[PDB]
């Protein structure tokens, strides 16, 4: 149908979550569905144990990837009244959230309600300090873009030249934590490959190494983000406090599961 | 040593090099509160709307982090470090008493 413009007058959709996390979930759920379809072809009693092994390995890999790519390591969130934009004295009541990951930080500004001052306040901005990417350039582009005041404030708090040294410590922590998480992913791949091979003890050792590298990345992130001088983030009449987000706890739980399974494999091999 | 210049200038004759101003060109009290929001937060005590002070309420906080105050060594005695340099909005506020 034509004769009218535009041919499609509906509002354009927005993807409801992170695209990287969504892609990881889709890929691993597709693998899970394929192996569930394959399940009736498995021989006999070794199906529930096979199911547990497959699901556990897939969960370990998905945890490694999602945690390495999740900007949810150091999280904080405060409800305040803050100035919204330039050339406007009106204030907004909103939840401002900080989500510092390995490669950058996501600053969220969600209105309460979302529709305030005849505007939709659901900002979710990313500022990345990954190797080869210039954080100062991204902050300058945000200033030119005209992002709301809380977003700009929390973004400049992580600039390399800001008096509180969040940028240096967080960049170092994220870089080396991501490196060790990639090492853990490689060890998980090798653990699967060598659990396919008849030498199960070496595969258990590689799984143990995966757990150890997860714990090492966790500890390095903790130590490097602890060395920060206290940066007071004050918005409106409140202070924002960051804490280890669910990415940190998923790292801890997955690493503990991997080290426990590796120790169990080694001890069972020794005892059998 | 040559000063900071606008990165978008100084490469071709029609757009020669132009110096970059390291403070806000406005007469906006930036020498008192700083030329950035993080600077102002570093200068505040967040109590009763006052600029942060040290043990003596008549003097601001001593400078600790190297990112805060210009710390040129004393020409006379050679004394260096932020041990006795106060924190102001202007980075070079301790150039002389």
């Amino acid at each position: 149908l034509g004769h009218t413009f535009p041919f499609y007058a509906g509002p354009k959709p927005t993807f409801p979550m992170d695209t990287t996390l969504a892609s990881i979930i889709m890929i691993f759920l597709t693998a899970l569905a394929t192996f569930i379809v394959i399940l009736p072809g498995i021989r006999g009693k070794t199906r529930l144990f096979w199911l547990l092994r497959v699901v556990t390995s897939l969960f370990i890999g998905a945890a490694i990837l999602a945690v390495n790519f999740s900007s949810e390591w150091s999280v904080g969130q405060v409800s305040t009244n803050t100035s919204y934009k330039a050339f406007s004295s009106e204030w907004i009541s909103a939840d401002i959230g900080l989500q510092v990951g390995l490669g950058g930080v996501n600053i969220t500004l969600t209105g309460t309600p979302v529709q305030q001052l005849n505007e939709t306040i659901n900002y979710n901005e990313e500022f990345t300090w990954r190797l080869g990417e210039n954080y100062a350039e991204e902050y300058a582009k945000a200033l030119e873009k005209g992002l709301p005041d809380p977003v700009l404030y929390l973004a400049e708090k992580f600039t390399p030249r800001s008096p509180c040294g969040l940028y240096r410590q967080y960049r170092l922590a994220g870089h080396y934590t991501s490196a060790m998480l990639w090492v853990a992913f490689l060890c998980w791949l090798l653990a699967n490959v060598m659990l396919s091979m008849p030498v199960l003890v070496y595969g258990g050792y590689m799984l143990l190494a995966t757990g150890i590298f997860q714990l090492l990345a966790l500890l390095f992130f903790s130590m490097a983000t602890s060395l920060t001088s206290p940066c007071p983030l004050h918005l409106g009449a409140s202070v924002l406090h960051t804490h280890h987000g669910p990415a940190f706890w998923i790292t801890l739980t997955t690493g503990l599961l991997c080290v426990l399974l590796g120790l169990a494999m080694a001890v069972a091999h020794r005892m059998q | 040593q040559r000063s900071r210049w606008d990165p978008e200038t100084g490469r071709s004759p029609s757009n020669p090099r132009d110096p970059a101003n390291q403070v806000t060109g406005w007469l906006d009290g930036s020498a008192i509160y700083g030329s950035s929001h993080s600077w102002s937060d570093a200068l505040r005590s967040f109590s009763r709307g006052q600029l942060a002070s040290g043990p003596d309420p008549a003097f601001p906080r001593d400078s600790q982090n190297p990112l805060l105050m210009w710390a040129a060594p004393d020409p006379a005695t050679g004394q260096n470090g932020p041990r006795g340099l106060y924190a102001f909005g202007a980075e070079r506020g301790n150039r002389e008493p």
């Binding site: 204030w91 200033l143 | 101003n21 950035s36």
Partner: peptide
């Protein structure tokens, strides 16, 4: 009523001029 009844001036000099947001700003 909010005691801050005006638009608080920015510390970095941005958004002071309506159409030239970099005017008078730090680094300009």
């Amino acid at each position: 009523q909010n005691p801050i009844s005006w638009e608080v001036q920015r510390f970095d000099g941005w958004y002071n001029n309506l159409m030239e947001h970099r005017w008078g700003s730090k680094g300009s």
